[PDB]
Design a protein around this ligand. Structure first.
Ligand SMILES: Oc1cccc(CNc2nc(Cl)nc3scc(-c4ccccc4)c23)c1
Ligand SMILES: Oc1cccc(CNc2nc(Cl)nc3scc(-c4ccccc4)c23)c1
Lengths: 229, 10, 220, 7
């Protein structure tokens, strides 16, 4: 973990990437607020299972106690789903690729009360990534940083986070960025994580309101994840 | 235990 | 954009707001919200002295302060509570432990204070971090965005300059820079929680909230 | 808004 080189760090993270899943989108019927939220909560639920497998393959994560592993995932899961969504929407300006069969524009997000506000932030993050030309190697480092950092303040984790910082710098130097450009781009990337936190908190409040108005039934897992917030 | 606790083991 | 790193640091140090002075459940949040209202007035003057901020349009200045104000209050609170392990110094005459607390937020602030203490955060680094929060927190919600990002890069350069001047190796500079910026995600989280708490206070209409604070909620 | 006049 702390003995991995940067290249080994990147290879392990790339090989751990979860698959892209399909939604239960039924094209025979129009969208309603309930059926659209139903699709997103069903997808998130199936993605969480693959998330767990992925987190076990993030170096340093298996070293933690089960309780600490639970806490980190409880804190970060929606940030992780969202940075994944933004990443795979990068090559679809103006749209969010929730799934290959669920590629939506903001007009479709207006179907769910309170959704377009979060939709617009995700679109803006995707545009930010596109203009910075975020690389897949950088993306997987950022996603692992979220897993380890978001719940951390609530030494080993910090040593692993430092290794990931080293790996980001190594990637940037390998790509030919000057020394000044390296620390500038590191800062620009890490500052986007503050916005991803923000969007996660809005989506968690949105999911809570969907539950509390009986718009869609949440799985037992989703209910416990919500409940930890 | 939490669903998540069990899933982390399987 | 023409200031040296040392000039950036002295400008931000010069602009630092003063520390202001301030139980029941209603009375304590009366104190906190009364304190926060007085600090906001000073924050506005400080923001105007963050290099580059006055170059922005009035609309953009309003948006950035509307998004960031509680984050900025909160990092200030953490900073002055840093030498008081296990307590929050809301004011010199208002030093609280967690039992007096809200407590979910209280604990998050305390853990941030302990992280600053753990890394021995310096005053010069603190003022850079507070300017980053101001410029970053609403920049995602063309020429004006490039100017904010150019100023943001300048403050990064200034942070790195401070760490180099302190003797850190290149590897240590990059690691500490990342450590500091990741704490800003936790500050965003606590501000989000604190806004929700503030919103519940305005709904319960027991604690008096100033016209100014009521407009800051409205923006969120 | 108040923030407008304050700035
Ligand atoms: O990888 C995925 C799979 C599904 C959804 C998402 C992003 N999730 C959202 N995105 C947008 Cl635009 N609007 C909304 S409003 C509520 C949520 C939400 C949905 C589910 C759980 C928690 C919160 C949400 C990413
Ligand atoms: O510089 C200052 C001056 C006063 C308070 C704070 C930090 N503010 C809080 N801290 C804690 Cl532990 N709990 C709570 S619950 C609600 C708030 C809150 C207070 C005011 C406005 C918006 C939200 C809050 C920093």
């Amino acid at each position: 973990a702390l003995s991995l080189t940067a290249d080994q760090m990147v290879s392990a993270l790339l090989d751990a990437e979860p698959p892209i899943l399909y939604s239960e989108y039924d094209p025979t019927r129009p969208f309603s607020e309930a059926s659209m939220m139903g699709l997103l909560t069903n997808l998130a639920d199936r993605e969480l299972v693959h998330m767990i497998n992925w987190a076990k393959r993030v170096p340093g994560f298996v070293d933690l106690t089960l309780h600490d592993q639970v806490h980190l995932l409880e804190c970060a899961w929606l940030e992780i789903l969202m940075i994944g969504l933004v990443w795979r929407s990068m090559e679809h300006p103006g749209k969010l690729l929730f799934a290959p069969n669920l590629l939506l524009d903001r007009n479709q997000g207006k179907c769910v009360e309170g959704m377009v506000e979060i939709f617009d932030m995700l679109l803006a993050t995707s545009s930010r990534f596109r203009m910075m030309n975020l690389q897949g190697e950088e993306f997987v480092c950022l996603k692992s940083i979220i897993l380890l950092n978001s719940g951390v303040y609530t030494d080993h984790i910090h040593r692993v986070l430092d290794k990931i910082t080293d790996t980001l710098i190594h990637l940037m130097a390998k790509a030919g960025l000057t020394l000044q450009q390296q620390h500038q781009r590191l800062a620009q990337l890490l500052l986007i994580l503050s916005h991803i936190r923000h969007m996660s908190n809005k989506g968690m409040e949105h999911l809570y309101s969907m539950k509390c108005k009986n718009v869609v039934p949440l799985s037992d897992l989703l209910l416990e994840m919500l409940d930890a917030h | 235990h939490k669903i998540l606790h069990r899933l982390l083991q399987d």
